[PDB]
Structure 1
Amino acid sequence: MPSPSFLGSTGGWLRCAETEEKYAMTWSSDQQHIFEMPTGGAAVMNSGDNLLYLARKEQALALATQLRTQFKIQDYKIYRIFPSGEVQYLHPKDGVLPYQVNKGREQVGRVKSTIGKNVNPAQV
């Protein structure tokens, strides 16, 4: 997919990036613009969705946070596993995490006092 062009190397051709899981984001980009990578200088944003490679998860979420402040665009980030497993970890509900959703659940939640008592009565 047409992606922004960047010069300066650094990010690409890293063995660790090849052997480790990589992140792939995308954005609508209805208009030609110019933005900045969280790890690079400046680059021109082309029309349509744009797929890039990222080596860190915080790098994958800070770019989405930066895009939301510019214009109003829904963001999609997909997180791939080492072999070839591609799972949708960002927006599995497709609803924005701060806003309220219907699909609700509780993971790792202790409902005890506040000073301590670290024992968990039930994990699920």
Structure 2
Amino acid sequence: LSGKTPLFAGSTGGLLTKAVEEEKYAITWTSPKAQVFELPTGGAATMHEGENLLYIARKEYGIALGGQLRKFKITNYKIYRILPSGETTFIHPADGVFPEKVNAGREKVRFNARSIGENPNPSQVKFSGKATYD
């Protein structure tokens, strides 16, 4: 991960020991202009001209931030998952296309060909380990 941290003096709302112990996420993006943007947790910061990087405690802070950057007309936002052993993964746009738009490589996951109304009654499914929504 390569990028400049946005300039802000610091804030109590931010990374805690859970970042070092369990996992921390990091959001990266590129800007045309240096502007002011509200951080995900308190305060304001001055994003640099290009290749900005920010470490966030949760994934929700990044996508929430990504929506704000879209209002500044920035859609090249990328999120990573950093584990304590240094492992990094391309999490949010696993495929390069955004989730809203379609791609052929994707496949159905947890699809029910029936309707919710046609779910089995739970009395038919008890003492078996099965749930109705399967």
Tell me if both proteins adopt one fold, taking TM over 0.5 as the criterion. yes
Q: Deviations over 1:92-120 (max 9, x none)?
A: 11101111222220112222232223253
Within-5 A mapping of 1:1-124: 1-11=3-13, 14-115=16-117, 116-117=119-120, 118=132, 120=134
Give the alignment's Cα RMSD to 1 decimal: 1.8
Supply the AA of the counterpart residue of 2:89: V
Q: Deviations over 1:15-64 (max 9, x none)?
A: 22211211111111121111110102111111111111111111121001
Q: Secondary structure at the match of 2:80?
A: strand
Q: Secondary structure at the match of 1:77?
A: strand
Whichever of the two has the greater Rg, that structure is 2
Structure 1's unaligned 5+ residue stretches are none
Q: Secondary structure at the match of 1:52?
A: strand
Say how many residue pairs are matched.
Answer: 120
Q: Secondary structure at the match of 1:39?
A: coil
TM-score, normalised relative to structure 1 = 0.84
**Deviation at residue 11 of structure 1 after TM alignment:** 4.0
More strand by share: 2
Within 1, Cα distance between the matches of 2:8 and 2:97? 31
- Percent identity for Structure 1 against Structure 2: 34
Q: Is the 8 A contact 2:16 2:57 kept in 1?
A: no
**Deviation at residue 82 of structure 1 after TM alignment:** 3.6
Deviates more, 1:4-13 or 1:74-83: 4-13
Within 1, Cα distance between the matches of 2:27 and 2:89? 12
Structure 2's unaligned 5+ residue stretches are 121-131
